Structure 1
């Protein structure tokens, strides 16, 4: 049968133009009050995943 896309993956990750995988930096969902402004802000930026894990994630989104 058709493979199914991992919905959890499609909700967390993005495939870029050139193949990279992209996600949101972890560690500002809570416990924020004491975290530095430098910390709090750097956790905005999307980050690129390291290839072996990115590549694995990729196989989970067959249709994109």
Structure 2
């Protein structure tokens, strides 16, 4: 009966501050290919896209 988040989601990053938000590793590109190099590698803080992150939310709601 209890739904329970795209557990998956909760798992793959997918984090919330009960304030009303979430984030995933900047994940812009990184930790994958990258015969890239430096400065580019400057993107690993965290990030969050609004609008959309609702589904995410309620799917989750209950734990993570």
| TM-score normalised according to structure 1 size | 0.45
Q: Closer, same or farther in 2 for the Cα pair 1:4/1:23, shift >3 Å?
A: closer
Provide the C-alpha distance between the structure 1 equivalents of 2:36 and 2:58, rounded to a whole number of angstroms.
30
Q: Closer, same or farther in 2 for the Cα pair 1:48/1:2, shift >3 Å?
A: closer
Q: Closer, same or farther in 2 for the Cα pair 1:27/1:55, shift >3 Å?
A: closer
User: What SS does the aligned partner of 2:23 have?
Assistant: strand
User: What SS does the aligned partner of 1:22 have?
Assistant: strand
Q: More helix by proportion, 1 or 2?
A: 1
Aligned residue pairs total 63
Give the 5 Å matches for 1:6-17.
6=7, 8-17=9-18
RMSD: 3.8
Q: Closer, same or farther in 2 for the Cα pair 1:56/1:37, shift >3 Å?
A: same
> Could you tell which deviates more after superposition, 17-26 or 33-42?
33-42
> Could you tell which deviates more after superposition, 23-32 or 35-44?
23-32
| TM-score normalised according to structure 2 size | 0.45
